[PDB]
Amino acid sequence: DYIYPEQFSYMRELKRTLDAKGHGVLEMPSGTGKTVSLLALIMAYQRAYPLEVTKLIYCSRTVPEIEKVIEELRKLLNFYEKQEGEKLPFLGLALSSRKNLCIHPEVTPLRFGKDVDGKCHSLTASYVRAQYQHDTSL
Amino acid sequence: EDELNLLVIVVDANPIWWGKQTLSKCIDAVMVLGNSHLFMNRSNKLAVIASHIQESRFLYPKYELLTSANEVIVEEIKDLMTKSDIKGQHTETLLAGSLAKALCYIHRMNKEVKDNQEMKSRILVIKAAEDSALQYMNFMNVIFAAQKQNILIDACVLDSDSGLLQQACDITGGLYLKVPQMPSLLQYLLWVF
């Protein structure tokens, strides 16, 4: 049970930089250590207010960088609970477009006028109809 | 002179010296060498040990001490001359024992010196005798201890074949010389090492 000397030196100032409840800017290294040290610096506030507990979201340019965020954060948590975990009893998830995650829905309705939003609407409609009385055929 | 230096000289007593025909001369030469060594620096010290056939013995333990050293050596060797282990009655010598004694002394001197600064020491063997298989474990034990200690073991083989000593120098990073012309003993001691 510990965290870096760097995190200890710059925690109070970072909690203060966070207090303003709207915005802030942070200087960090060229990449190695930056994202993991953020997770270490948000460990200080993982339950700042018990009556509402705020959440973290991260924005990312491409899919291979997302696995770098997940693999580091998976090492830091080690598990969702004290049963195997020791910094954060957190739950974390990757996501990206329906256009990336799902190949078969792009393939089957092949038409020019077939927006990625529309395909979720179409799949939802087949599921409601199929569940009703079309499961055998739609 | 800043560094204290202890040079231990192990003299192989073996009756091989008979083949030499002289021990008295060898002592005289060794004495001259010691006096020079002590004279070179204040901080130089010397210890002399005899590796005899039966056992190893301490001949002596500073340059001011030299007069004392000379007497102690002459007397000690004469006692050694005894008939037992005569001629090649016993080909080998107890070098392992001598080296053990030398390392003990070096260690003790070092501890005292530890109170102060570092000490540098090296061991010189004047070897007349031959090595034997039985000797291998004991000798190597002492040799390896010296190497770890980083104490060089130099050897001057007047005669005979002590392979272990040759190995001891390579190992220890010391110097080994098989002397052609044993009467040149003084030159080798001064020059060789």
Binding site: - | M140, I143, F144, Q147, Q166, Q167, D170, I171, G173
Partner: protein, 188 residues
């Protein structure tokens, strides 16, 4: 020091890059000269041992000395090599296969060792080098690399996988320290 017996195959880079003046007179001259100093110091520290000498030059491997226990052949071979110099590019796979062939023969309690002095960036050999590295580790042939100003990944993995000795040399003083490190025996 006595306790066991060593077999070591000294491998030298005789590529065109070894001609360069960066390390005294030129790298070839400074490396062979210090390597002669190492042979006599290793054989003095290791009286019961063997060495064999190989070079890589002009996209091939050549045997400068056969595997033997007399130091004199190896210093005489390092003297004879300097005149014929270096040109072209390595052949490391063929040099590890001839070295393997000699080293595989050796008995149970003796070391298996390859020492490489490396001033290149790759090697000309077509054969799959990873199969040969796997085979070195099974055979217990340990390979060490002393590189000149160079960390190119296949060589570094090859020395780590075979036992853990990829070293960089930036001066004639540093190269004598590295060879003198290799003079040191293994545990028995």
């Amino acid at each position: 020091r006595l306790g066991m017996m060593r077999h070591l195959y000294v491998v030298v880079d005789g590529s065109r890059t070894m001609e360069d003046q960066d390390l005294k007179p030129n790298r070839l001259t400074c490396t062979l000269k210090l390597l002669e100093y190492f042979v006599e110091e290793y054989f003095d520290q290791n009286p019961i041992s063997q060495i064999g000498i190989i070079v890589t030059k002009s996209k091939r491997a050549e045997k400068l000395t056969e595997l033997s226990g007399n130091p004199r052949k190896h210093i005489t071979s390092l003297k004879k090599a300097v005149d014929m110099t270096c040109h072209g590019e390595p052949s490391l796979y063929n040099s590890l296969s001839i070295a393997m062939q000699t080293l595989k023969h050796m008995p149970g309690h003796t070391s298996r060792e390859v020492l490489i002095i490396f001033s290149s960036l790759t090697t000309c050999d077509p054969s799959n080098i990873y199969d040969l590295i796997k085979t070195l580790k099974a055979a217990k042939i340990r390979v060490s690399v002393i590189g000149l100003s160079a960390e190119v990944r296949v060589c570094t993995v090859l020395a780590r996988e075979t036992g853990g000795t990829y070293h960089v040399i930036l001066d004639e003083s540093h190269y004598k320290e590295l060879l003198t490190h290799h003079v040191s025996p293994p545990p028995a």
